[PDB]
Design a protein around this nucleic acid. Structure first.
Ligand SMILES: [Mg+2]
Ligand SMILES: [Mg+2]
Ligand SMILES: [Mg+2]
Ligand SMILES: [Mg+2]
Ligand SMILES: [Mg+2]
Ligand SMILES: [Mg+2]
Ligand SMILES: [Mg+2]
Ligand SMILES: [Mg+2]
Ligand SMILES: [Mg+2]
Ligand SMILES: [Mg+2]
Ligand SMILES: [Mg+2]
Ligand SMILES: [Mg+2]
Ligand SMILES: [Mg+2]
Ligand SMILES: [Mg+2]
Ligand SMILES: [Mg+2]
Ligand SMILES: [Mg+2]
Ligand SMILES: [Mg+2]
Ligand SMILES: [Mg+2]
Ligand SMILES: [Mg+2]
Ligand SMILES: [Mg+2]
Ligand SMILES: [Mg+2]
Ligand SMILES: [Mg+2]
Ligand SMILES: [Mg+2]
Ligand SMILES: [Mg+2]
Ligand SMILES: [Mg+2]
Ligand SMILES: [Mg+2]
Ligand SMILES: [Mg+2]
Ligand SMILES: [Mg+2]
Ligand SMILES: [Mg+2]
Ligand SMILES: [Mg+2]
Ligand SMILES: [Mg+2]
Ligand SMILES: [Mg+2]
Ligand SMILES: [Mg+2]
Ligand SMILES: [Mg+2]
Ligand SMILES: [Mg+2]
Ligand SMILES: [Mg+2]
Ligand SMILES: [Mg+2]
Ligand SMILES: [Mg+2]
Ligand SMILES: [Mg+2]
Lengths: 43, 223, 68, 98, 102
RNA sequence: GGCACCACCAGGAGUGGAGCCUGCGGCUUAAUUUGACUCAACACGGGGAAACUCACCAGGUCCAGACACAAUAAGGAUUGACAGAUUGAGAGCUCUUUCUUGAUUUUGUGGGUGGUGGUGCAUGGCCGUUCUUAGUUGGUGGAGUGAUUUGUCUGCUUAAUUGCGAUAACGAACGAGACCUUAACCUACUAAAUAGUGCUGCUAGCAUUUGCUGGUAUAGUCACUUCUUAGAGGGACUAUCGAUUUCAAGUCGAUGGAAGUUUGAGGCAAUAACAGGUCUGUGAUGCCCUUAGACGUUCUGGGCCGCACGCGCGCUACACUGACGGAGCCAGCGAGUAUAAGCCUUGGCCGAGAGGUCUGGGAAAUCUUGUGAAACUCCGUCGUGCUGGGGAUAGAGCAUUGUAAUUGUUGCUCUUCAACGAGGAAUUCCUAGUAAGCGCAAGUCAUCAGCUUGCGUUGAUUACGUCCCUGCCCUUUGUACACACCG
């Protein structure tokens, strides 16, 4: 992030990532024949 | 067989250390936080805390069934002698292990570092952390390697309280040009601590003045 | 040296501005009082705070102190 | 790798019915304690299976953790000429606990 | 095989849970009129390992000093064997391990 | 300006001078693998290497080259092989020799995989260093158009940007301090047959006065927690009193105290940084190299020890404040096993010793173990002598470990008995249970500790001060540097 841009759009884009996840994650929590017998039936 | 007291507590610890790394490698994609080994009569309860308890308990719990079998066959345990439970972490934002794994899954998707780094700074604070500082080291397209720190809020550095209110998680990120090292230090708020001290050592809370009453000369109130 | 720090110097003089009538010139009585007045995380800081408060109390009777 | 057909068999009916296999990393071990064949055979036989996308392999602390894919159950369904009744044991839908 | 003299040995790394189980058993051995001897504080053992800090061999010779305290307590009870074992399940704790010897 | 025994002053012990141990360079080598070169490379890579370790050298095996193909292929794709030759080898490695197994597999293509191979100047992590010095930062307000600045300072004080105080600043944060661990106190609680004691049973020796020394005691089904152990607490906060001081922060003296140097000692430890060291810790890694006559891995043998030399960390010593010979005889920190692949080992019996053998205890406050350690102390011999100081070098012999001791692993016995007669220029560490001696345990470890990490025994001289040397920090200053004087 060496430019004055892409860090502007890194925080506002970054912070909306978290804001979408706190509400999504706080919603995720609020609404909370066998085989051995085939090897012995050779009678 | 016959194992000494000194060598038995160490063996339990060594078993825990080796078992813990096994989950980090296998359940890395599910935000593995930690494991709790609850010994009990006639059973060995193991509680794993992960962000996603669906990847472990998927397709009629096939993976967790096929995962407890990998531990019975390696430690010579009876098939009934071990029981694994998958428990969801209550506050995902306060777990640096989950936050470091989440950052790695974004960096490996080509997302920019600034957008990825601020995604954990705000996620940790949103969960209520007292402070957080993230250091990412490695090489990115440039031949020379660099490290960048992203602090926020209040952080303590020296003494015992760092062992009480701070948990840390370091992971190596496998990039096409080398290794990226990330450090996620999260300091929890001492007021919410339920087992250790509930405040910092130098926090002095003075009570309020209960005075400013009116005194009357000398009566006696009988009953 | 025995130079007290700021975490003990400022917390002790808040006590005088808040509980001067109940304070005294005796360290032993002051030490018990501050355990019910302040929430001190460690025993060592509690005695340190009361020991400097006693010095200030001993100094107030000889004239006016700066900061209280 | 040169495994006798019979020894390769025991390696296949251990990776099914308890569809997970654990093998310590020592090539000269006479007996892997759970498949009566050479330990090196188990590693190399299952290296092919994970090489052909039938088992996931995990390595931690000088130990191999082999788990059977759902796609690998079908492979042993036909090649072993076994009855079409599936679900080895870790797939028997024993269901988790809450 | 009724009332015996029975030893329960308690070992753990942390003392808070060790004393809670110890006190809880003493509490249950009080309201139940069972004569008891203990708890006996065995001298704690400090398992110390001193390694070099450097993964390589460069720098000032600096050393870590890790520790692992092991605390061991034994309690003697005079009760039938059925009573003592069920006391253990009442006061079962993940950290402390229990061995019972007659 | 300021601080500092990784600086000095006053001193102590020294090192450098000798022999030897060990590390580094060099030389040599078939290879003598390699990293590190001022502090911050050189008893450092826990690196005390007979095999392994091992990366080096001289040789010999295996694929442990997965997988999609193509080729070959039952009229047999291939693997193992007695005997002899060959080989260092009872390696079917290879060669004569025909037997066995049966589509697992042989050849080519891609693709792998594995590397103590290279790159630490491509990286993560870790660690060292600047530096554990005391430094760092933002809010509001003031100054400046601004980058910035003040706050973060004349003075005093402190171990400390830590405090007093001065103050266009006010009020704060990290670091420091608080914090955590350990050592020193508790006849005040809680208990202890894995700790100790008094009594008491039973019992021994010596003088008979009823006393003094013991053994025994997991049923005396006793008493107690001071000594021992450890959990909950208490206890020191510079407390009281004298001096100085801006009468402030503080400092120096006394008294009480277990403790009055941050109570002693440590652990953790800020904002940034170094091309510091490690890819020889990692199934941590990008890239380069190699990948079947391997730079993978294994087996055998050698080397890492090799010796005209320079340098560093150390051990013995140079004698009488001592050597021997008897005798006295006191610690603490710790460790210890099973059908193994063999742990700590008392006690008994052999042996001059080293050591051997038979039993027993202990997975451990129980047994090893009071680790009856060494310096040390007493009494003797020695008598200033290269001597009975010193014990290299070497000859002959006896045991232990290990598959294997030759280039002596180590220990023991006899003999040989060397330099060294207190060390030039220089230079290191250190202020109280400290320095210096002195041993013991744990780590490495089948064997080997002149090494580290700790522990305890005996236990001082001399400051408690300074910026004179040296290093670092702050302020001011100059700058044509900012990849920042390696400019
Ligand atoms: Mg702090
Ligand atoms: Mg500190
Ligand atoms: Mg010097
Ligand atoms: Mg001098
Ligand atoms: Mg000397
Ligand atoms: Mg070799
Ligand atoms: Mg070798
Ligand atoms: Mg190699
Ligand atoms: Mg580095
Ligand atoms: Mg401002
Ligand atoms: Mg401003
Ligand atoms: Mg400034
Ligand atoms: Mg400050
Ligand atoms: Mg602080
Ligand atoms: Mg007894
Ligand atoms: Mg008086
Ligand atoms: Mg201290
Ligand atoms: Mg370099
Ligand atoms: Mg470097
Ligand atoms: Mg590499
Ligand atoms: Mg490599
Ligand atoms: Mg490697
Ligand atoms: Mg190395
Ligand atoms: Mg080769
Ligand atoms: Mg060599
Ligand atoms: Mg060498
Ligand atoms: Mg040699
Ligand atoms: Mg050294
Ligand atoms: Mg050195
Ligand atoms: Mg003598
Ligand atoms: Mg003992
Ligand atoms: Mg002589
Ligand atoms: Mg002599
Ligand atoms: Mg000799
Ligand atoms: Mg000097
Ligand atoms: Mg050797
Ligand atoms: Mg040793
Ligand atoms: Mg060494
Ligand atoms: Mg300038």
């Amino acid at each position: 992030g060496q430019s004055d841009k892409r860090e502007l759009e890194g925080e506002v884009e970054g912070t909306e990532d978290a804001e979408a996840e706190l509400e999504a994650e706080a919603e995720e929590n609020d609404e909370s024949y066998l085989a051995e017998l085939e090897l012995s039936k050779q009678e | 067989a016959i194992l000494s007291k000194k060598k038995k507590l160490v063996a339990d610890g060594v078993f825990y250390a080796e078992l813990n790394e096994f989950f980090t490698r296998e359940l890395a994609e599910q935000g593995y936080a930690g494991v709790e080994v609850r010994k009990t009569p006639s059973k060995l309860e193991v509680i794993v805390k992960a962000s996603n308890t669906q990847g472990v308990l998927g397709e009629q719990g096939r993976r967790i069934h096929e995962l407890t079998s990998l531990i019975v066959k390696r430690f010579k345990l009876s098939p009934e002698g071990i029981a694994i439970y998958a428990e969801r972490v209550e506050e995902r934002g306060l777990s640096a292990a989950v936050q470091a794994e989440a950052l790695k899954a974004k960096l490996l998707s080509g997302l920019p570092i600034r957008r990825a780094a601020y995604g954990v700074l705000r996620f940790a604070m949103g969960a209520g952390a007292k402070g957080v500082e993230v250091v990412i080291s490695g090489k990115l397209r440039a031949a020379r390697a660099k490290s960048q720190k992203y602090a926020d809020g209040f952080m303590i550095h020296s003494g015992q309280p760092t062992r009480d209110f701070i948990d840390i998680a370091i992971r190596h990120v496998l990039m096409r040009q080398g290794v990226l090292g990330i450090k996620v230090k999260i300091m929890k708020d001492p007021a919410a601590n339920r087992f250790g001290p509930r405040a910092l050592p130098d926090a002095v809370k003075i009570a309020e003045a209960k005075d400013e009453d009116e005194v009357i000369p000398a009566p006696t109130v009988k009953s | 040296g025995r130079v007290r720090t700021k975490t003990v110097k400022r917390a002790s003089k808040v006590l005088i501005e808040r509980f001067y009538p109940k304070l005294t010139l005796d360290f032993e009585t002051n030490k018990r009082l501050t355990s019910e007045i302040a929430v001190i995380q460690s025993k060592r800081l509690r005695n340190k705070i009361a020991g400097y408060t006693t010095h200030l109390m001993k100094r107030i009777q000889k004239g006016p102190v700066r900061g209280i | 790798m040169l495994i006798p057909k019979e020894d390769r068999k025991k390696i296949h009916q251990y990776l099914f019915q308890e569809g997970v296999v654990v093998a310590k990393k020592d090539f000269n071990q006479p007996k892997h304690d759970e498949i009566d064949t050479r330990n090196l055979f188990v590693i190399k036989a299952l290296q092919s299976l994970t090489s052909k996308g039938y088992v996931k392999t995990q390595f931690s602390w000088q130990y191999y953790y082999y788990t059977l894919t759902d796609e690998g159950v079908e492979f042993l369904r036909t090649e072993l000429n076994i009855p079409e009744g599936i679900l080895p044991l870790t797939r028997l839908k024993n269901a988790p606990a809450e | 095989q009724q009332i015996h003299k029975i030893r329960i040995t308690l070992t753990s790394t942390k003392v808070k849970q060790l004393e809670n189980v110890s006190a809880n058993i003493i509490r249950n051995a009080a309201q139940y009129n069972i004569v008891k001897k203990g708890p006996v504080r065995m001298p704690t053992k400090v398992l110390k390992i001193t390694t070099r800090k450097t993964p390589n061999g460069e720098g000032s010779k600096t050393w870590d000093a890790y520790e692992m305290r092991i605390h061991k307590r034994v309690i003697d009870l005079q009760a039938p064997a059925s009573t003592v074992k069920r006391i253990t399940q009442i006061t079962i704790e993940p950290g402390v391990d229990v061995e019972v010897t007659i």
